[PDB]
PDB file of C-alpha atoms (C1' of nucleotides) in Angstrom:
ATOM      1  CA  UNK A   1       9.120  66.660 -42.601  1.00 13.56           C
ATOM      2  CA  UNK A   2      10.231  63.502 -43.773  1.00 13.50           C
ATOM      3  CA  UNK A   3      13.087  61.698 -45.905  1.00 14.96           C
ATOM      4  CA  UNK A   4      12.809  61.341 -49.443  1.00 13.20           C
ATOM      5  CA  UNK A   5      14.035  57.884 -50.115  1.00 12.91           C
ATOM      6  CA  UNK A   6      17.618  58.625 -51.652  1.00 14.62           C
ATOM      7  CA  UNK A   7      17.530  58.457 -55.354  1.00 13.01           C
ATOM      8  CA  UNK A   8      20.057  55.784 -55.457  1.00 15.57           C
ATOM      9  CA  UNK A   9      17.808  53.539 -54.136  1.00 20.18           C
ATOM     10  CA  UNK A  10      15.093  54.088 -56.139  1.00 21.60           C
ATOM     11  CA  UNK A  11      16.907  53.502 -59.000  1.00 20.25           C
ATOM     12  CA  UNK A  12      18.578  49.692 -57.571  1.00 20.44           C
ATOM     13  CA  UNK A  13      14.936  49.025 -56.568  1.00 20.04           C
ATOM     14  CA  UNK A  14      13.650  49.615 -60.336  1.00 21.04           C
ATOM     15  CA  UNK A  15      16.584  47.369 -61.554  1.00 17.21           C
ATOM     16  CA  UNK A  16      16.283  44.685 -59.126  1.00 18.03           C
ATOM     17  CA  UNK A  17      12.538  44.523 -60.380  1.00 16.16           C
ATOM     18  CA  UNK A  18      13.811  43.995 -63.866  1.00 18.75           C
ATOM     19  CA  UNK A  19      15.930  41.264 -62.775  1.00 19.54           C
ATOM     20  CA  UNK A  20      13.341  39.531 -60.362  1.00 18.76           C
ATOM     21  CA  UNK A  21      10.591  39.816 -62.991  1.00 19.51           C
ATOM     22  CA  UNK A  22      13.063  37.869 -65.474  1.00 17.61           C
ATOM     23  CA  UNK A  23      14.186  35.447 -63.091  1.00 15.35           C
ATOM     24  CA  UNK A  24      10.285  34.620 -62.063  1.00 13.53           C
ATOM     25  CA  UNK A  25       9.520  34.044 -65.651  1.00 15.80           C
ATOM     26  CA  UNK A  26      12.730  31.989 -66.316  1.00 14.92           C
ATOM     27  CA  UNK A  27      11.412  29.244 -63.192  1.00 13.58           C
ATOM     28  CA  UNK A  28       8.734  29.365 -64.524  1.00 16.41           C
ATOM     29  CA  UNK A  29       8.781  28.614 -67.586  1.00 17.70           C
ATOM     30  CA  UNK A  30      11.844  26.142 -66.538  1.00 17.09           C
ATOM     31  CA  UNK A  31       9.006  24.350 -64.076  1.00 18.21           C
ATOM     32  CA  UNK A  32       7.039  23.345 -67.272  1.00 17.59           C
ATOM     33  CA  UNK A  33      10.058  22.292 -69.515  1.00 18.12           C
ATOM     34  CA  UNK A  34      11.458  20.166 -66.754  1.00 18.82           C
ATOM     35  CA  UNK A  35       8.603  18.451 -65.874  1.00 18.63           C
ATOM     36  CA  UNK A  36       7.814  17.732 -69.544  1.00 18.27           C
ATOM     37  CA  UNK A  37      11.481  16.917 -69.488  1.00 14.56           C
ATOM     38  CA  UNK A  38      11.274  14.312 -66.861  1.00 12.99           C
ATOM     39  CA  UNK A  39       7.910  12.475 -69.080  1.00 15.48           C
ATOM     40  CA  UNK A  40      10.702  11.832 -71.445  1.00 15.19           C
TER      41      UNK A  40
ATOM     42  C1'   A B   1      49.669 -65.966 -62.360  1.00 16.55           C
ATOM     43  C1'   U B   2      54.964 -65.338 -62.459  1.00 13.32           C
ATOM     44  C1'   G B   3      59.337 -63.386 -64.530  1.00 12.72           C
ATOM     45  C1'   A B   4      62.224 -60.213 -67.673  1.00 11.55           C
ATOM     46  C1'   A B   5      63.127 -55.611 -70.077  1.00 10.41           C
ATOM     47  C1'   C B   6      61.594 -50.832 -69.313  1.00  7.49           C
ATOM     48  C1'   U B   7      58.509 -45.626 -67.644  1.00 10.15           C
ATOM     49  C1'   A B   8      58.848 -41.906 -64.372  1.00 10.58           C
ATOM     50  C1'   G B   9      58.618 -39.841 -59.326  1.00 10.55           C
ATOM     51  C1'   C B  10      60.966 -39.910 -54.268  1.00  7.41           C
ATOM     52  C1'   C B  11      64.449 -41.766 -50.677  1.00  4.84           C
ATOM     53  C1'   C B  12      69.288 -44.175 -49.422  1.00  4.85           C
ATOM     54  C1'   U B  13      74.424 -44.143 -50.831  1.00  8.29           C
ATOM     55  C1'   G B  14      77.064 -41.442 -54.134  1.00  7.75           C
ATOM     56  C1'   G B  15      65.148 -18.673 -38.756  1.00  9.38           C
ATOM     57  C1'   G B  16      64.416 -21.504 -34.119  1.00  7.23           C
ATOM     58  C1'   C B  17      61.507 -25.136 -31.473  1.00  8.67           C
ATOM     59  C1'   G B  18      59.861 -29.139 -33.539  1.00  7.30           C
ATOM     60  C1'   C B  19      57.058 -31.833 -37.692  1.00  9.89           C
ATOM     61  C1'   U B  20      56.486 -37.580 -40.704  1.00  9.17           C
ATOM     62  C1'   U B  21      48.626 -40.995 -42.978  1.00  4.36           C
ATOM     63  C1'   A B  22      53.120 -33.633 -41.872  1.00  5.71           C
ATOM     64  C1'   A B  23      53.753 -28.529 -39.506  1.00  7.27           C
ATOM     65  C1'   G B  24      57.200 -32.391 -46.105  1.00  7.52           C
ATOM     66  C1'   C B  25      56.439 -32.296 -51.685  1.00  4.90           C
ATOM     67  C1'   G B  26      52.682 -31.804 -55.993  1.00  3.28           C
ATOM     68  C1'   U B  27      47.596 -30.587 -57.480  1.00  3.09           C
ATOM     69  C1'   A B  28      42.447 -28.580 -56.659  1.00  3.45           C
ATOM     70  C1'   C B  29      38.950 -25.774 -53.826  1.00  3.80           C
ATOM     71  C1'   U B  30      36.984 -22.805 -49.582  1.00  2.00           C
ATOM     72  C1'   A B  31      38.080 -19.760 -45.378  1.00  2.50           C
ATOM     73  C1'   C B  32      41.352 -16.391 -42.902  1.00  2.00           C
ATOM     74  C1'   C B  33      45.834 -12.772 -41.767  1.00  2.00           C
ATOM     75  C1'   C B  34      47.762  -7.351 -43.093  1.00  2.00           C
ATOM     76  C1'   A B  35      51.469  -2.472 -46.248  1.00  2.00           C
ATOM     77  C1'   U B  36      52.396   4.059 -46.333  1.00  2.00           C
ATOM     78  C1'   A B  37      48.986   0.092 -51.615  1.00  2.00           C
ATOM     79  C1'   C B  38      43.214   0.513 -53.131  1.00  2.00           C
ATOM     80  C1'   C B  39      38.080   2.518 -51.708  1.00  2.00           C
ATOM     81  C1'   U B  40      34.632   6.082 -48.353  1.00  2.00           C
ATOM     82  C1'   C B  41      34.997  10.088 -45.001  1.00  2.00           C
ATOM     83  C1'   A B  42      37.233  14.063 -42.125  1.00  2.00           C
ATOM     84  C1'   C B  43      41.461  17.640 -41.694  1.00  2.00           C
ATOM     85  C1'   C B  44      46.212  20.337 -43.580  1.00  2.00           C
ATOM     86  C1'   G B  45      48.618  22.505 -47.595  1.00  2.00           C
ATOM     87  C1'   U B  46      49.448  23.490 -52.766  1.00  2.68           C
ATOM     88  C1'   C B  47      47.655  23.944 -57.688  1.00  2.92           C
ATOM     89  C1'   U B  48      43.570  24.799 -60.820  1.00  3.49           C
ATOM     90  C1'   G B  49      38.655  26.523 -62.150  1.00  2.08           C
ATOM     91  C1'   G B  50      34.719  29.798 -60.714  1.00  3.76           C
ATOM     92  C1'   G B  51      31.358  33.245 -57.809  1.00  3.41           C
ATOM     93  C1'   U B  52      31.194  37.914 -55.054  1.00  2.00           C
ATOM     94  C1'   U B  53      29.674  46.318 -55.336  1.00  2.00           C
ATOM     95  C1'   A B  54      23.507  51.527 -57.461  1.00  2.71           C
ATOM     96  C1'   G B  55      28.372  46.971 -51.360  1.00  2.25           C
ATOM     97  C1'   C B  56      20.006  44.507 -50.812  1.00  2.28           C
ATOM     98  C1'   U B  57      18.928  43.577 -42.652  1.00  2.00           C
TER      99        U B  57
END
RNA sequence: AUGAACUAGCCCUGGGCGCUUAAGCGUACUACCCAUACCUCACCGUCUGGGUUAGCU
C-alpha cells in the first residue's frame, strides 16, 4: 500500500544524526570557549 | 683711513628659441610633473595547496 522508505536511507539518516548531534555539541561548546576567549 | 703682500671663487684673454638682480652657477626648503617600477582592485593563464559520493531538493 505504501513505500517502505529504502533501507539505504535509513541508514544515511541514522549517520547524519551522529554527525549533526556532534557538530551541535562542538558550536556549542565552541560558543562558550570563544566568548571566554574574547574576555581575555 | 690708505697701501702692500696674499686667500679663494667667477669672467676676460690665453637640443632649439631665447635667458642675464636668470630660464646661469652653488646651497637650503616647499610644491608639482610621470615609467611597463610600487600599492589597491578586476580579468587571463600557469604553478601550488586544499575541499567535494549510503552522490542530502
Amino acid at each position: 500500500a505504501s513505500i517502505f522508505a529504502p533501507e539505504s536511507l535509513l541508514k544515511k539518516t541514522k549517520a547524519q544524526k551522529q554527525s549533526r548531534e556532534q557538530i551541535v555539541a562542538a558550536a556549542a561548546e565552541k560558543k562558550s570557549a570563544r566568548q571566554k576567549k574574547r574576555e581575555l
